[PDB]
Amino acid sequence: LPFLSRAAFARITTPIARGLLRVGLTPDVVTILGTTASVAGALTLFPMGKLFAGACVVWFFVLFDMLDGAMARERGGGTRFGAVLDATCDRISDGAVFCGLLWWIAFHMRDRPLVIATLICLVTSQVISYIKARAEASGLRGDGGFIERPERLIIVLTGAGVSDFPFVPWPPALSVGMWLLAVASVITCVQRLHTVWTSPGAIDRMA
Amino acid sequence: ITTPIARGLLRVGLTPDVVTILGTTASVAGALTLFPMGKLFAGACVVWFFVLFDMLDGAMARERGGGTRFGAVLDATCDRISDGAVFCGLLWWIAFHMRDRPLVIATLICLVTSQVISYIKARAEASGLRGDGGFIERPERLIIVLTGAGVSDFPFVPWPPALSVGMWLLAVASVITCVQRLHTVWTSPGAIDRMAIPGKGDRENLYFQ
Ligand SMILES: CCCCCCCC/C=C\CCCCCCCC(=O)OC[C@H](O)CO
Ligand SMILES: CCCCCCCC/C=C\CCCCCCCC(=O)OC[C@H](O)CO
Ligand SMILES: CCCCCCCC/C=C\CCCCCCCC(=O)OC[C@H](O)CO
Ligand SMILES: CCCCCCCCCCCCCCCCCCCC
Ligand SMILES: CCCCCCCCCCCCCCCCCCCC
Ligand SMILES: [Mn+2]
Ligand SMILES: [Mn+2]
Ligand SMILES: [Mn+2]
Ligand SMILES: [Mn+2]
Ligand SMILES: [Mn+2]
Ligand SMILES: [Mn+2]
Ligand SMILES: [Mn+2]
């Protein structure tokens, strides 16, 4: 496995989770703390141009995201509230990532098309997840997309981080990552709506 | 009022879902063309017009013997996109043509919370819980932001501060609403019943609530 991957991190979530339980933390409190730290990092570092440090901080709390489930597993189970909270917190965290980067791009760069791309990523990031939740609320399916949420985050965070990379930065990488993610995200939206359409019971007329 | 319009659109060969998509595309085009140019009154009228137009898909579905679950999901998703475009369009004017960086922050809070408020409800329902209620739903959201924007640019007698009053009011009310709806999730029947967490992945050790 890649050394910074979630699959790698899953090899040490059990001792971490046991430690956090021992200290009296719960899964849901950990979800909130990690989300708050992630938002703080994105909204502090990105608007300052510290894109490599921000990307590292955000990626850490993508890994940290995995602790609430590991903790709940050690405690005998999770809850539906915990699942809703995790998902909701992920929406907020993603929103802060794009808002932080947006602040840097809008006010400290000269790339207005890139602002547009960042806004597309921001809105599609929410909508991609909304389609799936809203579909399931109606008893339909709404997943889909060639590229999953963690990998979508990898695209933009890699672009940001390389653009600000220590010693040997490649500034174009931020724009490359954002436009690639914008295109991928728009497509993912259409693909997910197609999954809704092909779900059992999706097009029966009622009432 | 709606029935004759709906029947006419059905005779054209339009369906509820096509009307949803068209109304949303027009609303998005209005917000993203008129708000970035500072035509906030015109943009607000265009957006409100297509809000009223979004009610026609339901009137049409009635005339057709009923709507579909897919149509409901599509309509709700389109509503998110339309709300996104409203705040993006205004953001562009505020960010690049005003000197009010705090207002940019308020606008971004509105942008994100407009999505998250709806998301909490849908995601709660996807788990058999509830996430409804709260101060800000879409009608209150649009009234506040579009009234502030329209008044700020009103013909003859504008009141420029209205844009900022509306955005800050909506920002604060929308954060509160997110907290309210998550409490509603928590109090929902079954929300904290313990559930077995099966491992996901090829190794069945990826654990998620
Ligand atoms: C020197 C250490 C950094 C070297 C690496 C380039 C750094 C790019 C900049 C910031 C990292 C933010 C993104 C980190 C993404 C890692 C994603 C990954 O490892 O892939 C596994 C994933 O869980 C499934 O694909
Ligand atoms: C024209 C002034 C309108 C300002 C409306 C603020 C109050 C609105 C009501 C409740 C929100 C209270 C929270 C206020 C937090 C905002 C503080 C701020 O920074 O105000 C700067 C403003 O953008 C300058 O137009
Ligand atoms: C309860 C859920 C709500 C949580 C929603 C949070 C998501 C982030 C949204 C808006 C903040 C975006 C702020 C962008 C960063 C601004 C940094 C900055 O430099 O501020 C400039 C200063 O005001 C100079 O006047
Ligand atoms: C002068 C330039 C004006 C730019 C206006 C701001 C552009 C914001 C771009 C994001 C638009 C938000 C709506 C996204 C629509 C995505 C549709 C998803 C497909 C289902
Ligand atoms: C520097 C910016 C810091 C912003 C903090 C962002 C906070 C994100 C986490 C929000 C999580 C919502 C928690 C509310 C839970 C409500 C449950 C009540 C029922 C008991
Ligand atoms: Mn988690
Ligand atoms: Mn998560
Ligand atoms: Mn998830
Ligand atoms: Mn996910
Ligand atoms: Mn409608
Ligand atoms: Mn609608
Ligand atoms: Mn509602």
Residue numbers in the entry:
A (entry chain A): 4 to 210
B (entry chain B): 15 to 223
Quote the study on this structure:
One such potential target is the mycobacterial phosphatidylinositol phosphate synthase (M. tuberculosis PgsA1). PgsA1 catalyzes the conjugation of the 1’ hydroxyl group of D-myo-inositol-3-phosphate (ino-P) with a lipid tail of an acceptor substrate, cytidine diphosphate diacylglycerol (CDP-DAG), forming phosphatidylinositol phosphate (PIP). 1 D-myo-inositol-3-phosphate+CDP-DAG→PIP+CMP 2 PIP→PI+Pi PgsA1 belongs to the class I CDP-alcohol phosphotransferases (CDP-APs), integral membrane proteins that catalyze the formation of a phosphodiester bond to merge a CDP-alcohol and a second alcohol, releasing cytidine monophosphate (CMP). The M. tuberculosis PgsA1 was identified as a promising candidate for drug development, due to its essential role in growth and proliferation of the pathogen and differences between the Eukaryotic and mycobacterial PI biosynthesis pathways.
To unambiguously assign the metal-binding geometry we also determined the structure of the Mn2+—substituted protein to 1.88 Å resolution, allowing X-ray anomalous dispersion identification of the metal binding positions. The Mn2+ substituted crystals diffracted to 1.88 Å and belonged to space group P212121 with one homodimer per asymmetric unit as for the apo structure. As expected, our metal-substituted structure reveals a di-nuclear metal binding site coordinated by D68, D71, D89, and D93 of the conserved sequence motif, as indicated by two clear peaks within a metal coordinating distance to the chelating carboxylate side chains. In chain B of the M. tuberculosis PgsA1 homodimer, however, the anomalous difference density, corresponding to the aspartate-chelated Mn-ions, is extended indicating two alternate binding positions for the metal ion in site 2 (indicated as 2a and 2b in Fig. 1d, e). Besides the anticipated protein-bound metal ions, additional anomalous difference density peaks were found: two in chain A and one in chain B. These additional Mn-ions appeared to be coordinated by serendipitously bound citrate molecules, most likely derived from the crystallization condition. Two citrate molecules are chelating two Mn-ions in chain A and one citrate molecule is found chelating one Mn ion in chain B. The citrate-Mn complex is most likely not biologically relevant and result from the presence of 100 mM citrate and 120 mM Mn2+ in the crystallization solution. The presence of the metal ions and bound Mn-citrate ligand complexes in both protein chains appear to have a stabilizing effect on the N-terminal helix and C-terminal loop which now can be indubitably traced in the electron density. In the Mn-citrate complex structure one of the citrate carboxylates assumes the position of SO42− (1) in both protein chains. However, the Mn-citrate complex revealed a plausible binding pocket for this substrate.
